[PDB]
Amino acid sequence: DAFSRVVADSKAAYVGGADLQALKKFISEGNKRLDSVNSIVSNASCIVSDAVSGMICENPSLISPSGNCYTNRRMAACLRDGEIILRYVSYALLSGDASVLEDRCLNGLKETYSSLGVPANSNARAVSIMKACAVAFVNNTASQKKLSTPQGDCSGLASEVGGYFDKVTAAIS
Amino acid sequence: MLDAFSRVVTNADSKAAYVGGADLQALKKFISEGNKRLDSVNSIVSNASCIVSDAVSGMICENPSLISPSGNCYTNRRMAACLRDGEIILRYVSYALLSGDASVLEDRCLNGLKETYSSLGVPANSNARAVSIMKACAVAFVNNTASQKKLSTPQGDCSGLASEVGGYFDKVTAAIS
Amino acid sequence: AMDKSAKAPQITIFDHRGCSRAPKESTGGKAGGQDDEMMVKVASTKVTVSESDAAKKLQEFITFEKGIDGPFTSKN
Amino acid sequence: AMDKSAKAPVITIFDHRGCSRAPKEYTGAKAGGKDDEMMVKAQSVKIEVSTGTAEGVLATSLAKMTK
Ligand SMILES: *C(=C)C1=C(C)C(=O)N/C1=C\c1[nH]c(/C=C2\N=C(C[C@H]3NC(=O)C(C=C)=C3C)C(C)=C2CCC(=O)O)c(CCC(=O)O)c1C
Ligand SMILES: *C(=C)C1=C(C)C(=O)N/C1=C\c1[nH]c(/C=C2\N=C(C[C@H]3NC(=O)C(C=C)=C3C)C(C)=C2CCC(=O)O)c(CCC(=O)O)c1C
Ligand SMILES: *C(=C)C1=C(C)[C@@H](Cc2[nH]c(/C=C3N=C(/C=C4\NC(=O)[C@H](C)[C@H]4[C@@H](*)C)C(C)=C\3CCC(=O)O)c(CCC(=O)O)c2C)NC1=O
Ligand SMILES: *C(=C)C1=C(C)[C@@H](Cc2[nH]c(/C=C3N=C(/C=C4\NC(=O)[C@H](C)[C@H]4[C@@H](*)C)C(C)=C\3CCC(=O)O)c(CCC(=O)O)c2C)NC1=O
Ligand SMILES: *[C@@H](C)[C@H]1/C(=C/C2=NC(=C\c3[nH]c(C[C@H]4NC(=O)C(C=C)=C4C)c(C)c3CCC(=O)O)/C(CCC(=O)O)=C2C)NC(=O)[C@@H]1C
Numbered sequence A: 001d002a003f004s005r006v007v008a009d010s011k012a013a014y015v016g017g018a019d020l021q022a023l024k025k026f027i028s029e030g031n032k033r034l035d036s037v038n039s040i041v042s043n044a045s046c047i048v049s050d051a052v053s054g055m056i057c058e059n060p061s062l063i064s065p066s067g068n069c070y071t072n073r074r075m076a077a078c079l080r081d082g083e084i085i086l087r088y089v090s091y092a093l094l095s096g097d098a099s100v101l102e103d104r105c106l107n108g109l110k111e112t113y114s115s116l117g118v119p120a121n122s123n124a125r126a127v128s129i130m131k132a133c134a135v136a137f138v139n140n141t142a143s144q145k146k147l148s149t150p151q152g153d154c155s156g157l158a159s160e161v162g163g164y165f166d167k168v169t170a171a172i173s
Numbered sequence B: 001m002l003d004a005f006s007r008v009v010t011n012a013d014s015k016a017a018y019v020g021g022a023d024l025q026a027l028k029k030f031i032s033e034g035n036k037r038l039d040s041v042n043s044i045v046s047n048a049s050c051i052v053s054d055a056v057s058g059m060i061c062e063n064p065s066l067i068s069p070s071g072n073c074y075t076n077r078r079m080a081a082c083l084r085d086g087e088i089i090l091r092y093v094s095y096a097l098l099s100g101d102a103s104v105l106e107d108r109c110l111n112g113l114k115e116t117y118s119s120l121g122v123p124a125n126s127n128a129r130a131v132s133i134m135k136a137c138a139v140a141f142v143n144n145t146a147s148q149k150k151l152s153t154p155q156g157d158c159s160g161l162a163s164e165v166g167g168y169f170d171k172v173t174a175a176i177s
Numbered sequence C: 001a002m003d004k005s006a007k008a009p010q011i012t013i014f015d016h017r018g019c020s021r022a023p024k025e026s027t028g029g030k031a032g033g034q035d036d037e038m039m040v041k042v043a044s045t046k047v048t049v050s051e052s053d054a055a056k057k058l059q060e061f062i063t064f065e066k067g068i069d070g071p072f073t074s075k076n
Numbered sequence D: 001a002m003d004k005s006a007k008a009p010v011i012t013i014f015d016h017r018g019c020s021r022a023p024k025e026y027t028g029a030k031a032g033g034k035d036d037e038m039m040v041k042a043q044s045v046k047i048e049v050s051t052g053t054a055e056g057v058l059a060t061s062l063a064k065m066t067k
């Protein structure tokens, strides 16, 4: 409830102590799930940068004068959107649910991109690079690793986050 | 000295300077290891934001008091100044690597720097850690032993240039520690 | 519907077991164990990127380098 | 001396061999080969960091720290 209000209520939700104990009874694999979310969120800036950089290095026309990332204004909007998408995917993983991702991020998004002329193939590539990043962070196989987590298998959570990225891809491609 | 960049390095003007074509052919024989050297610079500067942010956040995760209300990175103002300084230092190191000479780094970045930090209370132990993380980042980018598939450059041994850039970071560490 | 506001969930995960900075922000009392030193925070905030920051990123991107991870897929 | 200006040499390494966007900024002599498709740029620039970047690093640091 507290997170839903936030994502109707303006101030942040601070879920610690007994409230955190309760949260972990209503999400599957609660401890692993929070490790997985943190592995993405705490690395968000590199994930977004690498995805946008890779989208562009694969198609440099995006930063030519006719490309959709031309001008600082447009580049800013694209970097921003990568971050927005990653945030909604991360919240889907925190909550164990796609409903907010679908309702607040994806429903209407392709229509907006179509009217703006934001290129769908390029956008899909940014999303797919972010997906690859997230999978590796969940499984702790990125180049930058968390040192001391108890070892175990998070392949289920990695599959789950992959499915949220796939919803994004399906919605905008 | 890289003559095309004389006004850049003295902050004499804000004009861009360009070395292409025959001037670039000549630059690569003036400096040593020319192609590899330029690749090495490229791999560092193109990753500057991440290098600096990872170094500052690593300095902080090792010593969280830096962002406590009494710590020297507390507030967006102080954090931004610290990130800025990390980038300034990294960029002067990158110029030392481009030119193959530490002089500009020593003269325009390091000379007087410790005394400024002492006056401000910028903690030298913490600063040294930011610099050593940046160093580690640069060495990994330069001497990257992943397979060809994962490299932006033709595979070969850039361990010498990695050692050279490490020495420039060591000059920073010695100056401010 | 996607409401065009650029707002998105902002998550902070604090696994601060052993941290000497005392917790003061929870509102539901104590578990009587290590959950009392950990927290998930969620806010809804507008995502913004300045033009000057985008210029800095462009100066990195335009050279077609990469990080350690991933294959090199550029042709440029 | 360190001049307190917050300026630094910003280097951009443009190895744009094979690029369809024609070189034009460098006007010095040509090499007659692939050096004509590559360039080192340098510029004195005041280094600035935004409050958004500072906020991002703060959030990363809080999330990655433990004790
Ligand atoms: C330990 C790590 C730390 C050392 C050592 C140090 O000097 N500072 C350390 C931590 C630190 N925490 C904050 C800020 C916040 N921490 C939380 C989360 C905790 N509050 C709770 O109630 C619980 C559990 C019940 C927590 C776990 C929150 C919400 C904040 C406020 C900031 C926010 O992002 O909302 C700081 C920042 C400076 C400060 O507020 O002390 C530091 C450095
Ligand atoms: C090939 C890569 C590109 C494709 C395909 C495409 O659509 N755009 C491509 C490249 C590209 N270049 C620029 C801008 C600059 N390139 C240089 C360097 C070249 N100029 C020279 O004189 C030489 C060699 C002698 C070069 C190599 C410079 C200096 C710029 C200007 C910008 C800067 O950051 O200083 C762009 C950006 C848009 C444009 O100006 O065309 C792109 C995308
Ligand atoms: C806090 C829990 C904490 C950190 C934050 C982290 C800091 C840290 N980082 C390294 C080393 C490297 N970081 C690198 C940076 C990058 N690689 C990339 O691909 C992107 C573009 C960029 C930004 C993330 C690199 C290349 C390295 C070097 C290789 C390596 O992993 O070591 C260190 C190690 C420093 C050292 O060796 O002394 C540290 C401490 N670690 C934390 O604990
Ligand atoms: C342009 C020359 C260009 C790129 C830029 C790059 C893009 C690219 N990146 C990946 C995959 C990953 N990137 C990751 C990012 C990070 N790892 C870290 O440790 C830091 C903090 C962060 C930012 C650099 C990660 C984790 C991955 C996945 C690695 C793995 O699976 O182990 C790809 C691959 C995408 C795909 O598989 O579809 C690409 C193309 N490459 C370029 O050529
Ligand atoms: C895939 C994600 C990982 C992996 C994760 C595992 N984590 C395990 C246990 C664990 N993690 C935490 C921290 C977590 N809980 C919280 O409440 C918060 C923040 C609010 C976080 C970040 C805790 C507390 C625990 C419990 C053990 C402990 O006391 O530390 C774990 C063990 C199994 C399990 O508990 O279900 C695993 C497997 N492990 C991996 O190897 C991949 C890479």
Ligand SMILES: *[C@@H](C)[C@H]1/C(=C/C2=NC(=C\c3[nH]c(C[C@H]4NC(=O)C(C=C)=C4C)c(C)c3CCC(=O)O)/C(CCC(=O)O)=C2C)NC(=O)[C@@H]1C
Residues within 6 Å of the ligand: B024, B028, B034, B035, B036, B037, B038, B039, B040, B042, B141, B142, B143, B144, B145, B151, B153, B154, B155, B156, B157, B158, B161, D013, D014, D015, D038, D039, D040
């Ligand atoms: C360590 C730095 C790297 C690595 C580098 C290698 N680069 C090699 C060749 C090479 N690089 C360039 C590009 C360079 N020259 C320029 O003029 C500019 C920009 C102005 C740049 C960025 C060129 C032109 C060449 C030569 C032609 C080519 O082979 O493409 C190279 C091979 C040659 C050599 O060994 O001297 C290497 C090894 N290789 C690595 O594995 C690490 C990561």
Ligand SMILES: *[C@H](C)[C@H]1/C(=C/C2=NC(=C\c3[nH]c(C[C@H]4NC(=O)C(C=C)=C4C)c(C)c3CCC(=O)O)/C(CCC(=O)O)=C2C)NC(=O)[C@@H]1C
Residues within 6 Å of the ligand: A052, A062, A068, A069, A074, A075, A077, A078, A079, A081, A082, A084, A085, A104, A105, A109, A112, A116, A118, A119, A122, A123, A124, A126, C002, C003, C004, C005, C006, C007, C008
């Ligand atoms: C980056 C990987 C892309 C790219 C993105 C661009 N997006 C632009 C504008 C834009 N994006 C949205 C969606 C965004 N707002 C929200 O509220 C949410 C979710 C809740 C999201 C995901 C909107 C509504 C808009 C238009 C209004 C605005 O700018 O804020 C955009 C600017 C286009 C223009 O002004 O010309 C770009 C460039 N561009 C790319 O090339 C890659 C594929």
Ligand SMILES: *[C@H](C)[C@H]1/C(=C/C2=NC(=C\c3[nH]c(C[C@H]4NC(=O)C(C=C)=C4C)c(C)c3CCC(=O)O)/C(CCC(=O)O)=C2C)NC(=O)[C@@H]1C
Residues within 6 Å of the ligand: B056, B066, B071, B072, B073, B077, B078, B079, B081, B082, B083, B085, B086, B088, B089, B108, B109, B113, B116, B120, B122, B123, B124, B126, B127, B128, B130, D002, D003, D004, D005, D006, D007
């Ligand atoms: C980050 C790893 C540090 C940290 C750094 C701080 N530096 C602060 C102030 C500051 N730094 C410089 C040196 C800088 N200016 C230049 O012109 C050059 C080189 C040419 C460099 C390297 C100066 C002169 C100053 C004072 C003037 C100014 O800020 O512009 C600083 C304080 C900022 C503030 O309170 O506004 C910080 C926080 N702090 C840390 O904790 C780590 C170790």
Ligand SMILES: [Cl-]
Residues within 6 Å of the ligand: A143, A144, C068, C069
């Ligand atoms: Cl790395």
Ligand SMILES: [Mg+2]
Residues within 6 Å of the ligand: B103, B106
């Ligand atoms: Mg001298």
Ligand SMILES: [Mg+2]
Residues within 6 Å of the ligand: B152, C063, C064, C065, C076, D015
């Ligand atoms: Mg290249």
